[PDB]
Amino acid sequence: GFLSGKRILVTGVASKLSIAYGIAQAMHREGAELAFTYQNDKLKGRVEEFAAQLGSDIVLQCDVAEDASIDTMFAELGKVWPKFDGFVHSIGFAPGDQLDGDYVNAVTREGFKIAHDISSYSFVAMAKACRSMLNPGSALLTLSYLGAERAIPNYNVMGLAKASLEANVRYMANAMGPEGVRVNAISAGPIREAVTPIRRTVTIEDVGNSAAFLCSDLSAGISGEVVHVDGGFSIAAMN
Amino acid sequence: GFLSGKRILVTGVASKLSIAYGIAQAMHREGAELAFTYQNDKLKGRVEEFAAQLGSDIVLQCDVAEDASIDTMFAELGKVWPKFDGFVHSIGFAPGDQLDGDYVNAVTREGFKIAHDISSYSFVAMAKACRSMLNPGSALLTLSYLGAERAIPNYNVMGLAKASLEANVRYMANAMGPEGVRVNAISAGPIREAVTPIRRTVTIEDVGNSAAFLCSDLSAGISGEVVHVDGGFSIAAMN
Amino acid sequence: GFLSGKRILVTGVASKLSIAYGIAQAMHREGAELAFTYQNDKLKGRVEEFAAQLGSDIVLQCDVAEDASIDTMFAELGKVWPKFDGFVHSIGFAPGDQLDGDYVNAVTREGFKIAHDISSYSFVAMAKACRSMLNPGSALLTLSYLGAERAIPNYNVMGLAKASLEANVRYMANAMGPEGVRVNAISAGPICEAVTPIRRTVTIEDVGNSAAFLCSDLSAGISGEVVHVDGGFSIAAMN
Amino acid sequence: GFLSGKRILVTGVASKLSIAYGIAQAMHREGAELAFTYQNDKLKGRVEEFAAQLGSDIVLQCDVAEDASIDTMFAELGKVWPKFDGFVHSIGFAPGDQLDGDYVNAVTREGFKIAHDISSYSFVAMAKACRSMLNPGSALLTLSYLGAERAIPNYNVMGLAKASLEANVRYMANAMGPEGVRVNAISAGPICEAVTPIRRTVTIEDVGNSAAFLCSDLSAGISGEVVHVDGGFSIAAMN
Ligand SMILES: [N]C(=O)C1=[C][N+]([C]2O[C]([C]OP(=O)([O-])OP([O])(=O)O[C][C]3O[C](N4[C]=NC5=C4N=[C]N=C5[N])[C]([O])[C]3[O])[C]([O])[C]2O[B@@]2([O])C3=C([C]=[C][C]=[C]3)[C]=NN2C([N])=S)=[C][C]=[C]1
Ligand SMILES: [N]C(=O)C1=[C][N+]([C]2O[C]([C]OP(=O)([O-])OP([O])(=O)O[C][C]3O[C](N4[C]=NC5=C4N=[C]N=C5[N])[C]([O])[C]3[O])[C]([O])[C]2O[B@@]2([O])C3=C([C]=[C][C]=[C]3)[C]=NN2C([N])=S)=[C][C]=[C]1
Ligand SMILES: [N]C(=O)C1=[C][N+]([C]2O[C]([C]OP(=O)([O-])OP([O])(=O)O[C][C]3O[C](N4[C]=NC5=C4N=[C]N=C5[N])[C]([O])[C]3[O])[C]([O])[C]2O[B@@]2([O])C3=C([C]=[C][C]=[C]3)[C]=NN2C([N])=S)=[C][C]=[C]1
Ligand SMILES: [N]C(=O)C1=[C][N+]([C]2O[C]([C]OP(=O)([O-])OP([O])(=O)O[C][C]3O[C](N4[C]=NC5=C4N=[C]N=C5[N])[C]([O])[C]3[O])[C]([O])[C]2O[B@@]2([O])C3=C([C]=[C][C]=[C]3)[C]=NN2C([N])=S)=[C][C]=[C]1
């Protein structure tokens, strides 16, 4: 399919429900050779099994909180893919207390720091560590959400981290474009209705197919873009 | 390819340089069966020849200035495609005096009326006339430009017509979504550099591949969206 | 007041409830000398009544559907004010059956034409006709609505006209800026209470106060801008 | 003046050139009683000098990197003002080598952390610490830049921090709105002349005038908004 010839690193697979699992399935279906990271010992086996099902045995530890963990992961990847064609960043975190109740009362310096570090800084952290490894025609992809652009109850400091992430997409697109690298985001709708134009929530298949496109040469003209894959939800009001 | 099974009507082919020609080529490459309209007697032969080269002999007259011309075209199409899966609207016009010099001095009531009528109203005019003919899963596509969002010298009243067109995308997406129809726009970069992140202007191949995606089931999650296919130009400043 | 020494023409006063009324009130409070237009003879007396209360006896007929009516209004105005400091455009119209039900079904070529002509073209028609009369430091103001940016049920074709209007703000600002004229819009909330950050609907006073600022030299740094005066409604979601 | 009866805290006065200075001046002109903070002992005298000229002897140390410093500042302030009417946040910082050259190369985890903590988290840190002190009708104001929305060379990680900041405006506006507090930002132009619609760079006076409006009850209808005070620069392209 339209990704044949392409080697893509997929982060953030934690289950069959993971957006990153929808994405990996779509990309494998389209001929991509895939590699996988897992955060910790808890997730290793699950990811190894998913990776084997998608014809891959590149399954590498990466905790994006640590610069050393990222560098080590890309050194391991280089033994088998001295060059590759980009990555899917489907990662973020905020401490649980951050994401419930009044935003101003919930947010703390430490919660803000972690949300921004894991959910925004890590995208460019990965880009920096693998920069010389990317072929011309490479594409990077991250996942965002409408809370970056609107104040959504409870989403709280993650809205700010996502806004930071979307700016990071633009700054990265601008920096790496001259070396033949594109950088985009998908702003996905919430994954499981009456107010969405298409009258349903998007599925990880929808998200996956858009992701496959944005990482393929089919999207050669698209960079620094946040594409809304939310069924039109964000463009409607008072439906 | 990813458009097999799909019947798409393509408007706006006037030459090999036409965006709509890039789009038709991409879609044919991906397995779509195509139909074509031509504005007038001058363009008929060129379009017939392009259509034959892309395995089609559905070549129908349509001048979107006239409600009768549109209805007649869709009656002719119905004899051969009683149902189809959407259309590509790659059409607009403003009188030549509109598009040069100071916007306020150039614009006239009549120029504004024509620019908006041909370049914005015609998208929904076509949708209205073929509404009952569209299958569930249908996609409509139009072409826009950054002048809808920024004031660009000389682009003048067409900027306003394009802003109207982009709103029309949202309103149409919202109206037709419940019947299984998606509606998007591509905001293409100018087609033939130092300031664009990807360091080149997009080509009708870039535009065509994005268009093929947006009219395919691969983009099932995307509606009422204006996707920038301009190489990142609009997201950079002072480059 | 912060409008002392300013002469501002105000269109669209139709009653004591009109947004244009709240605007005229706030401007008069702030030291502006005002002039008023009215659409037809049906409203001549009533508008003379309002102008009276606001220190004005400059009351002129103007139907923005006609170039000759606009021209003759500014000629009359020129007899009292050979120079003045800008105007407020608070005018718009679509035929009634445009504004009910499914957009794609309701919209017609003629309904589209009128909505755009009266609600968008008229803004620049007015600027063209008084361009040579404007002092340096002049400001033009129009009134938009969130329907320009989002698909709102029943707002239908007015959404497109308002999008054309906001583009018109940008193109006008760009063209007239160099001779010292600013051009802006206010996107007002409806005159919703439950989901607005400020937990109330805005008033003609809130709107009038922002209008007065945007036509004064206090807003000297602001041009080409759509200022949302809707209590934050448009930046919130799922409240 | 239109700020009579208001008590507003102003951060970020570092010299007579500071945007915060132009803001304090405009507010004092309009009848506001002011208080000032300063970052370190290096600036204590100089800021007392400015406060003096602006009818104020409320001058308090505050380093926004520390929760205890913010807490102790608002405790001191509480002795003169048990209640007040909001504050201006005109504070931000990235280590210097963050702001030069290719973004992906310059950015580090620590540089990112600091930029976001000082330029974005501090805004909400301040709101949290004085939340119970704010009168109904209070307004908070921060200062952003177009780098939040576009990739600007060398602005680098500050672009992400400002995007986080503008999201913070929205989330703060949403959370504090119901108790009668508004929150907005001004995105100021640089303090370019050739491509700005108004053909000049904006001044600390233009900025100060818009700031004064946005902290006054005149802007009662405006919350959650980023107001561009850049002479229209961001709405123009290819000028
Ligand atoms: N879901 C939905 O709806 C959505 C989502 N979004 C986004 O995307 C992404 C992804 O997610 P998901 O797939 O869903 O989830 P999960 O599966 O859980 O995943 C995550 C991941 O990450 C990782 N990590 C963490 N931390 C870390 C990591 N790695 C490495 N290192 C470190 N340190 C784990 O492991 C996993 O795998 C995301 O980003 C999202 O976002 B959010 O915010 C959201 C959600 C939901 C909704 C909305 C939003 C969730 N979550 N999140 C986060 N996490 S941040 C988008 C849209 C939609
Ligand atoms: N090019 C570029 O760069 C671009 C473009 N854009 C858009 O898209 C569209 C399409 O275009 P093109 O392809 O390029 O061109 P042509 O070829 O010429 O085509 C057109 C068409 O249309 C038609 N018509 C007209 N009128 C009519 C018709 N049909 C029917 N009926 C009627 N009445 C003809 O025939 C032809 O075929 C468009 O839309 C565009 O836009 B614009 O504005 C632009 C340009 C350039 C640049 C920019 C923009 C051109 N043109 N235009 C118009 N026309 S409106 C987008 C982006 C880019
Ligand atoms: N309301 C609300 O909420 C709003 C509104 N907006 C806008 O603003 C403007 C103004 O309106 P109002 O004030 O509201 O109302 P009125 O009083 O009725 O006014 C109107 C005016 O106009 C004029 N005209 C007409 N036609 C014509 C004229 N002139 C001349 N010529 C001609 N042809 C009359 O007379 C009067 O005075 C407007 O623009 C508005 O918009 B809309 O769309 C809307 C509404 C509602 C809501 C939303 C929107 C209503 N209406 N509209 C129209 N009409 S266009 C804004 C915001 C809000
Ligand atoms: N300039 C211009 O053009 C602009 C600006 N913007 C903004 O605003 C603000 C303020 O700034 P300015 O006034 O300009 O400056 P200054 O005077 O130097 O100020 C600063 C301040 O802060 C403070 N701090 C620091 N650190 C700290 C503090 N406090 C406390 N704690 C701590 N740790 C000091 O002391 C002073 O006072 C800002 O925010 C700005 O932003 B940015 O970014 C920018 C610039 C330029 C341009 C653009 C942007 C500069 N800078 N920056 C910073 N820093 S962040 C806006 C617009 C415009």
CATH topology of chain A: Rossmann fold
How far apart, in Å, are the first and last alpha carbons of chain A? 38 Å
- What is the highest CATH level, the class of chain A? Alpha Beta
Total number of beta strands of chain A: 7
Provide an overview of this structure:
Four copies of one chain form a homotetramer. By secondary structure, chain A is α/β, with parallel strands linked by helices. Chain A has one domain (1-239): Rossmann fold (3-Layer(aba) Sandwich), CATH 3.40.50.720. Chain A is 39% helix and 18% strand. Chain A is built from seven helices and seven strands. Chain A has helices at 19-29, 41-53, 67-78, 103-106, 109-130, 157-176, 204-214; strands spanning 7-10, 33-38, 59-61, 84-89, 134-144, 181-188, 226-229. In chain A, strands 3-2-1-4-5-6-7 form a seven-stranded parallel beta sheet, sandwiched between helices. In chain A, helix 2 (41-53) links the parallel strand 2 and strand 3. In chain A, helix 3 (67-78) packs parallel to helix 5. The first copy, chain A, is globular and about 50 Å long. The termini of chain A are far apart. Chains in contact: A-B, A-C, A-D, B-C, B-D, C-D. Chain A binds chain B through residues 1-2, 170, 173-174, 177-178, 180, 182, 188-189, 196-199, 202-203, 205-207, 209-210, 212-213, 217-225, 227-232, 235-236, 239, and chain B through 1-2, 170, 173-174, 177-178, 180, 182, 188-189, 196-199, 202-203, 205-207, 209-210, 212-213, 217-225, 227-232, 235-236, 239. The complex binds a molecule of 2 linked components (NAD-CJ3) (4 copies). It is classed as oxidoreductase/oxidoreductase inhibitor. Keywords: enoyl-ACP reductase, Oxidoreductase-Oxidoreductase Inhibitor complex.
